[PDB]
Amino acid sequence: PNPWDDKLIFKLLSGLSKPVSSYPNTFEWQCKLPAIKPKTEFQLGSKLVYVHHLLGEGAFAQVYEATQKQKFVLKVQKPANPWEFYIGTQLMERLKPSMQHMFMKFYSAHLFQNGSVLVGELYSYGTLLNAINLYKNTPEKVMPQGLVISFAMRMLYMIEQVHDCEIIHGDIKPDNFILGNGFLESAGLALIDLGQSIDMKLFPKGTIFTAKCETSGFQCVEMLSNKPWNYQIDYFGVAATVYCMLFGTYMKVKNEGGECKPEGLFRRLPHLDMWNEFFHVMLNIPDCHHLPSLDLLRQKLKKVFQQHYTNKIRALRNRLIVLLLECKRS
Numbered sequence: 191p192n193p194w195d196d197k198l199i200f201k202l203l204s205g206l207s208k209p210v211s212s213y214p215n216t217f218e219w220q221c222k223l224p225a226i227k228p229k230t231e232f233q234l235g236s237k238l239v240y241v242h243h244l245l246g247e248g249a250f251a252q253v254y255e256a257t258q259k260q261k262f263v264l265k266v267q268k269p270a271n272p273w274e275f276y277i278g279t280q281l282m283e284r285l286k287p288s289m290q291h292m293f294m295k296f297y298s299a300h301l302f303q304n305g306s307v308l309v310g311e312l313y314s315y316g317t318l319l320n321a322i323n324l325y326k327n328t329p330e331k332v333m334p335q336g337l338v339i340s341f342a343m344r345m346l347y348m349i350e351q352v353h354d355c356e357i358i359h360g361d362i363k364p365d366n367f368i369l370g371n372g373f374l375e376s377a378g379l380a381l382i383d384l385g386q387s388i389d390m391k392l393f394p395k396g397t398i399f400t401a402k403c404e405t406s407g408f409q410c411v412e413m414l415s416n417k418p419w420n421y422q423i424d425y426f427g428v429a430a431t432v433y434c435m436l437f438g439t440y441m442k443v444k445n446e447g448g449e450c451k452p453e454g455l456f457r458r459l460p461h462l463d464m465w466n467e468f469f470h471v472m473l474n475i476p477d478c479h480h481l482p483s484l485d486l487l488r489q490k491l492k493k494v495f496q497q498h499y500t501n502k503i504r505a506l507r508n509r510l511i512v513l514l515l516e517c518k519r520s
């Protein structure tokens with residue numbers, strides 16, 4: 191199967207015992223997607239909504255901040271994307287209530303003839319990618335190890351929960367992580383954008399995929415060698431995200447001695463042995479039946495974190511908060 195095939199996705203959504211159209215918080219309208227703009231009111235079903243400003247632009251969608259006094263977000267996309275609403279609904283259903291804070295809730299979905307509007311939870315302090323870019327514009331240039339390791343551990347923990355729900359995110363990268371006000375109180379880190387996600391419960395047991403991402407660079411290890419894959423795509427995504435935090439550029443992998451490893455000479459990289467082991471396990475998965483333990487991966491990082499950064503993490507996050515606030519004020 192091609193898990194991103196529009197026909198397959200249509201067939202899957204069509205044959206659900208509980209289709210998206212049946213949800214109490216789904217709203218189907220027989221009209222075009224209304225014009226949405228910053229600083230403008232517009233009718234959304236029974237409720238009138240005021241659109242504040244554009245928060246971010248993804249590969250497909252626009253995400254606006256909005257209010258009815260609680261503020262929320264509107265993810266707008268052409269054509270409609272009921273699939274992301276499905277996945278988001280399943281994820282929050284399958285997740286333990288204590289895990290849901292690490293992800294974005296969808297309050298409702300408004301589906302139109304030519305597009306859709308998903309209403310969901312707001313995270314106020316920008317993407318992880320933006321945080322990385324904020325460090326570029328400082329003398330220290332790169333995020334400090336205390337934060338990088340802390341975020342990395344949270345990422346491993348996050349996808350362990352998602353995979354426990356038998357879901358694949360399918361697009362794990364820096365701009366799909368958001369920081370919220372909880373960070374001011376890796377607590378406020380959240381993983382969003384389930385548009386390309388895969389629900390493995392909709393396929394037979396042990397199903398695998400061969401389909402490849404469009405770009406040669408964003409392809410995981412299995413894709414680059416036409417090998418089959420399922421959950422390994424999220425492992426590669428986490429590894430690539432961590433690599434961006436470390437080096438401020440996207441990860442490109444090479445093959446040496448049958449082993450896959452990131453390029454770059456890894457100069458000026460502290461905890462070298464920790465990261466080599468981290469990238470080794472994440473990028474060298476024997477097969478779909480031998481996925482490395484996400485818990486164990488996190489424990490090894492946690493060992494180094496506890497050894498060096500428990501007393502310093504406080505100042506490190508305060509430093510970042512100042513940069514985030516400076517960014518938000520502008």
Ligand SMILES: Nc1ncnc2c1ncn2[C@@H]1O[C@H](COP(=O)(O)OP(=O)(O)O)[C@@H](O)[C@H]1O
Pocket residue numbers: 245246247248249250251252253263265294311312313314317365366368382383384385
């Ligand atoms: N919950 C959120 N709070 C604030 N901004 C968000 C939120 N979700 C997404 N965004 C912003 O919108 C952008 C695109 O949304 P995303 O879900 O990635 O859609 P796409 O599938 O088009 O990438 C993100 O990169 C981010 O900047």
Ligand SMILES: [Cl-]
Pocket residue numbers: 343344347
């Ligand atoms: Cl953790």
Ligand SMILES: [Mg+2]
Pocket residue numbers: 248249365366383
């Ligand atoms: Mg995105």
Ligand SMILES: [Mg+2]
Pocket residue numbers: 248249250361383384385386
């Ligand atoms: Mg997306």
